[PDB]
UniProtKB/Swiss-Prot annotation:
One of its GO terms (molecular function) is enzyme binding. PANTHER family: DNA DAMAGE-INDUCIBLE PROTEIN I (PTHR36572:SF2), DNA DAMAGE-INDUCIBLE PROTEIN I-RELATED (PTHR36572). The keyword Chaperone does not apply. The gene is dinI. Involved in SOS regulation. Inhibits RecA by preventing RecA to bind ssDNA. Can displace ssDNA from RecA. This is DNA damage-inducible protein I. Pfam families: DinI.
Amino acid sequence: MRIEVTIAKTSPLPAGAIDALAGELSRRIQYAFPDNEGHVSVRYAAANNLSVIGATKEDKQRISEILQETWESADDWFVSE
């Protein structure tokens, strides 16, 4: 399964957050999907978009939920220099 996340450039994150986000998301994906290789990429695009290839609708809802939860727990897993 391949997971791609795009963030609108109109919303800049500190010079370290994107890499941190991609790392946190990947760990979450691996825990949720032990039997399937998950690859997560994060890049700036004209618009915010989430694309999932090689997954089922239920997997995709769970992933959206995971993204929601990780995103909501940002103060705990995100560290800034």
